[PDB]
């Protein structure tokens, strides 16, 4: 219970640290190439998993696996990946303001701000599988329906 | 009768073309206005429902 | 000939293009604020024919 929780958390943190440190160690390098690149900066299970990942050479998103390590401590589900698209490139202040503003769900959810300048002066915010569209291109089509 | 139907179809097509041209002009004007003023003013609308 | 006459009449901005564009900018593009922070030159120059 309590002992397991601290143990699980410590193991997750260690795994995340190993993945972040040794992700680029065997990154891209093939099974024979990354075998030497495989350092002692991993547990034997972690070293075996890194060897399996770099046997094909797909050891690029291991940092995401590192990001997968801490969330698995708390059963994840905090991704809440949202995507914001606006016609003008977002300034850092307003970007942070709208990042904070979508706190109704989980707070500063994973947001990958996009531009797509085909839009005119609006917001397309997709949280999970619900999209909100107040872009003036949407209003443009909603008026252009007169055709 | 066929000539009258063709005239009606031509009138409808002309109305559709006028609507499309008006939409394109409105889009260009809105784009110019957004470039001048700045789209940041629309950010406050993000709290309308989200 | 009738379609050409209608197109010539609609080519003028003050007849169809300018008024419709201004109405769309005011009621649709904005919340009853056509001026925004400019667009004075875009009302006429961008209208063209």
From Swiss-Prot, chain A:
Record's protein name: ATP synthase subunit delta
Query: What InterPro entries does its record include?
Result: ATPase_OSCP/d_CS (IPR020781), ATPase_OSCP/dsu (IPR000711)
Keyword Cytoplasm listed? The answer is no
- Tell me which PANTHER family the record gives: ATP SYNTHASE DELTA CHAIN
Q: What Pfam families does its record include?
A: OSCP (PF00213)
What is an example of a GO molecular function annotated in this UniProt entry?
A: proton-transporting ATP synthase activity, rotational mechanism
Name the protein family.
Belongs to the ATPase delta chain family.
The major lineage groups are: Bacteria, Bacillati, Chloroflexota, Chloroflexia, Chloroflexales
- Give the quaternary structure: F-type ATPases have 2 components, F(1) - the catalytic core - and F(0) - the membrane proton channel. F(1) has five subunits: alpha(3), beta(3), gamma(1), delta(1), epsilon(1). F(0) has three main subunits: a(1), b(2) and c(10-14). The alpha and beta chains form an alternating ring which encloses part of the gamma chain. F(1) is attached to F(0) by a central stalk formed by the gamma and epsilon chains, while a peripheral stalk is formed by the delta and b chains.
The record's Gene Ontology cellular component field reads: plasma membrane; proton-transporting ATP synthase complex
- Highest taxon in the source lineage: Bacteria
Q: What membrane topology was assigned to this protein in its record? A: Peripheral membrane protein
Annotated localization = Cell membrane
Spell out the PROSITE patterns in the cross-references: ATPASE_DELTA
Organism listed in the record: Chloroflexus aurantiacus (strain ATCC 29366 / DSM 635 / J-10-fl)
Keyword field: ATP synthesis, Cell membrane, CF(1), Hydrogen ion transport, Ion transport, Membrane, Transport
Q: Name one GO biological process term.
A: proton motive force-driven ATP synthesis
State its role: F(1)F(0) ATP synthase produces ATP from ADP in the presence of a proton or sodium gradient. F-type ATPases consist of two structural domains, F(1) containing the extramembraneous catalytic core and F(0) containing the membrane proton channel, linked together by a central stalk and a peripheral stalk. During catalysis, ATP synthesis in the catalytic domain of F(1) is coupled via a rotary mechanism of the central stalk subunits to proton translocation. This protein is part of the stalk that links CF(0) to CF(1). It either transmits conformational changes from CF(0) to CF(1) or is implicated in proton conduction.
Curated annotation (Swiss-Prot), chain C:
The source's superkingdom equals Bacteria
Compartmental location: Cell membrane
The signal peptide stretch is none
Q: What subunit structure does UniProt give?
A: F-type ATPases have 2 components, F(1) - the catalytic core - and F(0) - the membrane proton channel. F(1) has five subunits: alpha(3), beta(3), gamma(1), delta(1), epsilon(1). F(0) has four main subunits: a(1), b(2) and c(10-14). The alpha and beta chains form an alternating ring which encloses part of the gamma chain. F(1) is attached to F(0) by a central stalk formed by the gamma and epsilon chains, while a peripheral stalk is formed by the delta and b chains.
- Family recorded in the similarity comment: Belongs to the ATPase B chain family.
Described purpose of this protein according to its UniProt entry: F(1)F(0) ATP synthase produces ATP from ADP in the presence of a proton or sodium gradient. F-type ATPases consist of two structural domains, F(1) containing the extramembraneous catalytic core and F(0) containing the membrane proton channel, linked together by a central stalk and a peripheral stalk. During catalysis, ATP synthesis in the catalytic domain of F(1) is coupled via a rotary mechanism of the central stalk subunits to proton translocation. Component of the F(0) channel, it forms part of the peripheral stalk, linking F(1) to F(0).
Write down what this protein is called: ATP synthase subunit b
Q: Which organism is it from?
A: Chloroflexus aurantiacus (strain ATCC 29366 / DSM 635 / J-10-fl)
Full-sequence range covered:
111 to 159 of 164
């Amino acid at each position: 219970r309590a002992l397991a929780a601290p143990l699980v958390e410590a193991l997750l943190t260690t795994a995340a640290e190993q993945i972040r440190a040794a992700a680029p160690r065997i990154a891209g390098l093939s099974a024979s190439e990354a075998a030497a690149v495989l350092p002692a900066d991993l547990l034997p299970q972690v070293r075996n998993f890194l060897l399996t990942m770099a046997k094909e050479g797909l050891t690029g998103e291991l940092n995401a696996v590192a990001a997968a390590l801490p969330g698995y401590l708390e059963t994840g589900s905090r991704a809440v990946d949202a995507s914001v698209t606006s016609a003008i490139e977002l300034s850092a202040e307003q970007k942070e303001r709208i990042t904070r503003e979508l706190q109704q769900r989980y707070g500063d959810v994973h947001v990958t701000y996009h531009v797509d300048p085909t839009l005119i002066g609006g917001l397309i915010i997709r949280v999970g599988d619900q999209v909100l569209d107040n872009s003036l291109r949407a209003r443009l089509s909603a008026i252009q329906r007169v055709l | 009768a066929q000539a009258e139907q063709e005239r009606i179809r031509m009138l409808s097509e002309a109305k559709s073309q006028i609507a499309d041209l008006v939409t394109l002009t409105a889009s260009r004007v809105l784009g110019a206005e957004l470039q001048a003023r700045g789209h940041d003013a629309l950010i406050a609308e993000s709290l309308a429902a989200l």
